[PDB]
Amino acid sequence: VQTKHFTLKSDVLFNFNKSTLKPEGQQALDQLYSQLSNLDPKDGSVVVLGFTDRIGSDAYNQGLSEKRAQSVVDYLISKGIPSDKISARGMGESNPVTGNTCDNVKPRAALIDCLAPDRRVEIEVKG
Amino acid sequence: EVQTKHFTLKSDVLFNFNKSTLKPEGQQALDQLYSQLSNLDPGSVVVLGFTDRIGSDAYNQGLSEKRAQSVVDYLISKGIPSDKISARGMGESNPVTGNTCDNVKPRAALIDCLAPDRRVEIEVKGVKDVV
């Protein structure tokens, strides 16, 4: 089994608290799909995971992350990924890539900036 | 299970126009990357440099090599062992913009349209730990 893992910035794909792909988001997914289409495997699978930062309501962040992941999957299916070979999952605030690095960044705007790497969609491709 | 994790960095942030020396903002972006890399449990790293299709292909190939090497040199300085990372210039090959920019004018507009092509890709390859 060999995966390839990719990451896209949620701040690019979506507006603040929204889950509709922006034009910039579609373009980012077009560019990724261009890369993914360079291989023609017999079979494979794609897993799309949405993540938020640790700020705000966890129930709201879970819901938002799931809708974001779904919007990405729906678009990628539109581009050509077969619907039964791709799945979406919202992971909410879990598994931050910033780990404990932003733990003591106090001022709200500075913390939001420090947490930016956590606001992301991860795409795992198996072939 | 062998897994490759891919990271993409905008060349326009890392480097000034036509230069291969990291800007301070490039070092800061690589510091952020290194933090995340240092949490991936070991492994090897390839750094790919890409340009847009403007100008000499020989020149673009050389510029892409120097940019990739600059990134590698700095990542080693952060703690990536020297024997586990390498640089590769890709010049103008393998663009991500498709045909999207094919008929774009004027020139300033074209440089903007091709921006996603100007990038450094970092591939971290490793084995899933098990027993």
Short mmCIF file of C-alpha atoms in Angstrom, two decimals, chain A:
data_model
loop_
_atom_site.label_atom_id
_atom_site.label_comp_id
_atom_site.label_asym_id
_atom_site.label_seq_id
_atom_site.Cartn_x
_atom_site.Cartn_y
_atom_site.Cartn_z
CA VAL A 1 0.00 0.00 0.00
CA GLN A 2 1.36 3.45 -0.94
CA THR A 3 -0.53 6.62 -0.09
CA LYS A 4 0.10 10.15 -1.24
CA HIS A 5 -1.12 12.83 1.19
CA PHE A 6 -1.94 16.46 0.18
CA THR A 7 -3.05 19.52 2.15
CA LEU A 8 -5.06 22.55 1.08
CA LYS A 9 -5.62 25.72 3.06
CA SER A 10 -9.18 26.09 4.24
CA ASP A 11 -8.78 29.87 4.30
CA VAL A 12 -8.28 29.72 0.53
CA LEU A 13 -11.05 27.24 -0.29
CA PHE A 14 -13.79 28.84 1.79
CA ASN A 15 -14.98 32.12 3.34
CA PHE A 16 -15.05 32.61 7.12
CA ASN A 17 -17.52 30.06 8.62
CA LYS A 18 -18.80 29.02 5.23
CA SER A 19 -18.56 25.66 3.40
CA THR A 20 -19.20 26.72 -0.21
CA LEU A 21 -16.09 26.42 -2.35
CA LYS A 22 -14.92 29.80 -3.52
CA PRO A 23 -13.68 30.33 -7.11
CA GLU A 24 -10.14 30.17 -5.65
CA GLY A 25 -11.07 26.86 -4.05
CA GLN A 26 -12.30 25.38 -7.30
CA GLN A 27 -9.08 26.54 -8.96
CA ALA A 28 -6.98 24.91 -6.20
CA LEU A 29 -8.90 21.67 -6.70
CA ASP A 30 -8.49 21.91 -10.46
CA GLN A 31 -4.69 22.16 -9.94
CA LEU A 32 -4.70 19.13 -7.62
CA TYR A 33 -6.89 17.11 -9.94
CA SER A 34 -4.35 17.93 -12.74
CA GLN A 35 -1.66 16.27 -10.61
CA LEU A 36 -3.86 13.33 -9.63
CA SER A 37 -4.75 12.71 -13.29
CA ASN A 38 -1.08 12.03 -14.16
CA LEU A 39 -1.54 8.44 -13.06
CA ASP A 40 -4.12 5.89 -14.40
CA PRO A 41 -4.28 3.14 -11.73
CA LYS A 42 -6.46 -0.04 -11.91
CA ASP A 43 -8.17 0.94 -8.66
CA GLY A 44 -7.61 3.26 -5.73
CA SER A 45 -9.35 5.38 -3.18
CA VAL A 46 -9.43 8.93 -1.91
CA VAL A 47 -10.14 10.16 1.60
CA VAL A 48 -10.89 13.77 2.23
CA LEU A 49 -10.61 15.10 5.81
CA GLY A 50 -11.71 18.53 6.98
CA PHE A 51 -10.19 20.27 9.99
CA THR A 52 -10.77 23.51 11.88
CA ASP A 53 -8.75 25.35 14.46
CA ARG A 54 -9.50 24.95 18.15
CA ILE A 55 -11.42 28.25 18.45
CA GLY A 56 -15.16 28.40 18.98
CA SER A 57 -17.86 25.78 19.39
CA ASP A 58 -16.74 22.20 18.94
CA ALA A 59 -20.17 21.12 17.65
CA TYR A 60 -20.12 23.96 15.11
CA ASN A 61 -16.52 23.19 14.09
CA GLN A 62 -17.31 19.50 13.60
CA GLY A 63 -20.32 20.37 11.39
CA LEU A 64 -18.39 22.98 9.42
CA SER A 65 -15.46 20.54 8.85
CA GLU A 66 -17.81 17.86 7.55
CA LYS A 67 -19.54 20.22 5.11
CA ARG A 68 -16.16 21.53 3.91
CA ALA A 69 -14.88 17.97 3.32
CA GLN A 70 -18.10 17.12 1.47
CA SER A 71 -17.86 20.21 -0.73
CA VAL A 72 -14.35 19.16 -1.71
CA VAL A 73 -15.44 15.57 -2.45
CA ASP A 74 -18.43 16.73 -4.49
CA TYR A 75 -16.22 18.96 -6.58
CA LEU A 76 -13.58 16.28 -7.13
CA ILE A 77 -16.30 13.86 -8.21
CA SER A 78 -17.45 16.54 -10.70
CA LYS A 79 -13.90 16.61 -12.04
CA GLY A 80 -13.85 12.84 -12.60
CA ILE A 81 -13.18 10.93 -9.40
CA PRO A 82 -15.73 8.05 -9.25
CA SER A 83 -18.20 8.63 -6.49
CA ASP A 84 -17.77 5.20 -4.82
CA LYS A 85 -13.95 5.61 -4.55
CA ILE A 86 -13.91 8.84 -2.46
CA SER A 87 -15.22 9.76 0.94
CA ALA A 88 -15.52 12.81 3.15
CA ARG A 89 -15.04 13.11 6.87
CA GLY A 90 -15.17 16.13 9.19
CA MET A 91 -12.51 15.91 11.94
CA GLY A 92 -13.36 19.24 13.58
CA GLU A 93 -10.69 20.61 15.88
CA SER A 94 -8.86 17.31 16.26
CA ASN A 95 -5.33 16.40 15.25
CA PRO A 96 -3.95 19.98 14.86
CA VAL A 97 -0.76 20.24 12.82
CA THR A 98 0.40 23.08 15.03
CA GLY A 99 0.35 20.60 17.95
CA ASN A 100 1.09 22.55 21.14
CA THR A 101 3.08 25.37 19.40
CA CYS A 102 0.30 28.06 19.68
CA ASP A 103 -0.60 27.13 23.27
CA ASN A 104 0.53 30.41 24.85
CA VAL A 105 -0.23 32.89 22.08
CA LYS A 106 -2.77 35.13 23.83
CA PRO A 107 -4.02 38.06 21.65
CA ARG A 108 -6.99 36.86 19.61
CA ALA A 109 -5.81 37.99 16.17
CA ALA A 110 -2.28 36.64 16.79
CA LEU A 111 -3.68 33.27 17.88
CA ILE A 112 -5.91 33.06 14.81
CA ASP A 113 -2.85 33.65 12.72
CA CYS A 114 -0.74 31.09 14.62
CA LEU A 115 -3.54 28.49 14.20
CA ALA A 116 -3.87 29.01 10.41
CA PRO A 117 -2.05 25.72 9.55
CA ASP A 118 -4.79 23.83 11.38
CA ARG A 119 -7.56 25.24 9.11
CA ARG A 120 -7.10 22.77 6.29
CA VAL A 121 -8.42 19.96 4.15
CA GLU A 122 -6.28 16.84 3.86
CA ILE A 123 -6.54 14.55 0.84
CA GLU A 124 -5.18 10.97 1.02
CA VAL A 125 -4.86 9.10 -2.34
CA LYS A 126 -4.25 5.35 -2.59
CA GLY A 127 -3.49 3.63 -5.95
#
